[PDB]
């Protein structure tokens, strides 16, 4: 999960500088960066939301035991 999250933030910075340049070398590269970000989140959502669901429910049990 950390490998897909680190690579996702790096592609966002590269896609920002490509929008400032308008030529025959930035429009083609920008389409490849946006296409790669769609495949990273495809295999990340079944793992990111699954980890947050288990962590969000396990942390709530600890707060319940501290008040009992």
């Amino acid at each position: 999960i950390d490998k897909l999250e680190r690579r996702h933030l790096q592609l966002e910075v590269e896609a920002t500088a490509l929008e400032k340049e308008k030529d025959a070398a930035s429009k083609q590269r920008l389409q490849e960066v946006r296409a790669e970000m769609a495949r990273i989140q495809e295999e990340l959502r079944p793992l990111k939301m699954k980890y947050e669901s288990e962590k969000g429910r396990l942390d709530e049990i600890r707060n319940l035991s501290q008040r009992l």
């Binding site: 790096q10 910075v13 590269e14 920002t16």
Partner: protein, 68 residues
């Protein structure tokens, strides 16, 4: 080393107007200047056919520190 360190800080602080203006603008403009000086060093050593022995830290500079 300063441009690569300041660019990583803007990415973690959610700033796309600073990290993208350094990694693909400041870094490429500074690396091309160093490449022009690297070719001049190799061409200067061919005419001398021995180079400068007072630039690379080797075993000669290590034995002098222990002797003192």
């Amino acid at each position: 080393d300063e441009l690569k360190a300041k660019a990583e800080d803007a990415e973690r602080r959610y700033d796309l107007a600073r990290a993208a203006d350094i990694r693909y603008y400041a870094i490429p403009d500074l690396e091309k200047r160093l490449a022009q000086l690297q070719a001049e060093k190799s061409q200067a050593d061919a005419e001398r056919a021995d180079g400068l022995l007072a630039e690379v830290v080797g075993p000669d500079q290590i034995m002098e520190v222990v002797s003192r």
